[PDB]
Amino acid sequence: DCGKPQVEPKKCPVVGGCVAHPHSWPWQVSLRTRFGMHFCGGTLISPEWVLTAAHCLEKSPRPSSYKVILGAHQEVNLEPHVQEIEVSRLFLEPTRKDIALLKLSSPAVITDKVIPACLPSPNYVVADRTECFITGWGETQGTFGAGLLKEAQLPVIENKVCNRYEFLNGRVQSTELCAGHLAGGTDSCQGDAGGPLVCFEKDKYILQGVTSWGLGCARPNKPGVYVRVSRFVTWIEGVMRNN
Ligand SMILES: NCc1ccc(CNC(=O)[C@@H]2Cc3ccc(cc3)NC(=O)CCN3CCN(CCCC(=O)Nc4ccc(cc4)C[C@@H](NS(=O)(=O)c4ccccc4)C(=O)N2)CC3)cc1
């Protein structure tokens, strides 16, 4: 059952936002070096497959350089039941987009704390103002929560508006989407890249974005940019089917 957490998440009362109800985001992964250091996020989309950002793998083209942590809440004191799995193969998106697939050495064990997120239908366009969630262990820029999994509820901004001069001035492609509060203060940041942007649809969470880049973090009029997952579903499915 993809997209359905067992520990229901909570809204807030990653820069800003709040600490996540522990294990309320069971698809969240921590992408780490062979040495145990968190540097990027990821999303479990199937027991053997993690979706992250291509730029997170810029340092090494070697699957051995990476490990995936599943089911955690703490970044340092990993809980005992935490699943730590090596990566066997890396798949960079073939058109140089900032998205990539990780095939794990062993299929993650599905538990109340480790659950895959659902994928959207091809070419779905998250509507303007849709409130979605981003999560990760990234920088907090003095906002509390360092070391614990944080979340933020952000409104999507349609590309036509996001590309205006007042915002990102034509930098955003159709294969990306924008999200964030234009007054600033709450945003994903370095360390959250490759992590999920999920939207609640009917009764479950759908992976709609991959945290990619931005002009800084939580700055006014500077929403974050995310890879538009719906434009890569067909490629993702082909990779999982043929590998
Ligand atoms: N929700 C906020 C948020 C969450 C998470 C993050 C974490 N992710 C990062 O750190 C990314 C890493 C990266 C991602 C994609 C890339 C290259 C690098 N893709 C290409 O290489 C592909 C080639 N491409 C093609 C087209 N491009 C031009 C058009 C669009 C464009 O201009 N894109 C852009 C602009 C700036 C940067 C990267 C990309 C550098 C840096 N931005 S920053 O201002 O210096 C900064 C940000 C945060 C903190 C401090 C400083 C920035 O984000 N790096 C140029 C190059 C960051 C922000």
What is the 3 state secondary structure string of 34-103?
CCCCEEEEEEEEECCEEEECHHHHCCCCCHHHEEEEECCCECCCCCCCCEEEEEEEEEECCCCCCCEEEE
Distance CA 116, CA 71 (A): 11
Pocket residue to mutate for ligand 1, from 39, 178, 213, most atoms within 8 A of Cβ: 213
Token pair, residue 19, equals: 């600490």
Can you name the residues that pair with 51 across neighbouring β-strands? 43, 101
Token pair, residue 138, equals: 């990234």
**Distances from the Cα of 99 to the Cαs of 39, 147, 227, in angstroms?**
16, 25, 7
Nearest CA to ligand 1 atom 9: 213
Q: Tell me which method was used to determine the 3D structure.
A: X-ray
Helix (H, G, I), strand (E, B) or coil at 111: strand
Q: What is the resolution of this structure in A?
A: 1.8
Distance CA 146, CA 148 (A): 6
Token pair, residue 75, equals: 């970044």
Question: 208 near 199, Cβ under 8 Å?
Answer: yes
Residues 6+ apart with CB under 8 A from 10: 18, 20, 21, 24
Distance CA 234, CA 228 (A): 12
Can you name the residues that pair with 102 across neighbouring β-strands? 50, 90
Token pair, residue 80, equals: 């005992």
Name the helix (H) or strand (E) containing 213: strand 204-213
Which atom of ligand 1 lies closest to the CA of 217? 2
Q: Max CA-CA distance within the chain?
A: 49
Length of the chain: 243
Distance CA 98, CA 92 (A): 8
Please, how many CA atoms are within 13 Å of residue 111, restricted to the half-sphere of its CB?
12
Residue 29 burial (10 A CB sphere; 0-12, 13-18, 19+):
buried
Tell me the CA–centroid distance for residue 175 and ligand 1, in Å: 15
Q: Which residue do the tokens 């659902």 mark?
A: 118
The domains of the chain, with CATH numbers, are 28-116+232-242 (2.40.10.10), 118-230 (2.40.10.10)
Token pair, residue 126, equals: 């998250």
Chain-centre distance for alpha carbon 223: 16
Helix (H, G, I), strand (E, B) or coil at 131: strand
Distance CA 105, CA 64 (A): 10
Tell me the CA–centroid distance for residue 193 and ligand 1, in Å: 10
What is the b/e burial string over 103-128, where b = at least 16 CB atoms within 10 angstroms of the residue's CB? bbeeebeeeebbbbbbbbeeebbbee
Compute the radius of gyration of the chain from its Cα atoms.
Answer: 16
Name the helix (H) or strand (E) containing 233: helix 233-242
Tell me the CA–centroid distance for residue 216 and ligand 1, in Å: 8
